[PDB]
Design a protein around this ligand. Structure first.
Ligand SMILES: Cc1cn([C@H]2C[C@H](OP(=O)(O)O)[C@@H](COP(=O)(O)O)O2)c(=O)[nH]c1=O
Ligand SMILES: [Ca+2]
Length: 129
């Protein structure tokens, strides 16, 4: 996989942002994770964690996997990096997202993320508390 540029337009919630990609506004949905919706337990904490990470970043990058790049709602599907750190992984590692929506052929970083999840669960963080 390869990283590509984007800029933040607006943080939205635990697992979506509005990014400018190739000069066009798009909603992006994080691959391989699920955060609680804002109305749900740890929802606001996930939103805030994601927001801070992408707003504080000097450089945002998107990394598409090998399969589908947009979902049925027209959202981009990517791994999102904030100054080289994967937002997807960071949410999982803090117990603010579960590994989820693992579809065959768009699952390059599955094991990386499952490792993070196991460490969050061991530490009983947030969702796992
Ligand atoms: C993360 C992800 C979600 N989706 C679709 C499946 C789910 O469909 P449904 O809307 O029919 O449930 C929805 C979950 O996203 P959200 O967790 O953002 O709601 O988005 C994909 O199609 N591919 C993906 O990689
Ligand atoms: Ca969600």
């Amino acid at each position: 996989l390869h990283k590509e540029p984007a800029t933040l337009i607006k943080a939205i919630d635990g697992d979506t942002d509005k990014l400018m990609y190739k000069g066009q506004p798009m909603t992006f949905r994080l691959l391989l994770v699920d955060t609680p919706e804002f109305n749900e337990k740890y929802g606001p904490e996930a939103s805030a964690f994601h927001k801070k990470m992408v707003e504080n970043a000097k450089k945002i990058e998107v990394e598409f996997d090998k399969g589908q790049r947009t979902d049925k709602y027209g959202r981009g599907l990517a791994y999102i990096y904030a100054d080289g750190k994967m937002v997807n992984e960071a949410l999982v590692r803090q117990g603010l997202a579960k590994v989820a929506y693992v579809y065959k052929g768009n699952n390059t970083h599955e094991q990386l993320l499952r490792k993070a999840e196991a460490q969050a669960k061991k530490e009983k963080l947030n969702i796992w508390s």
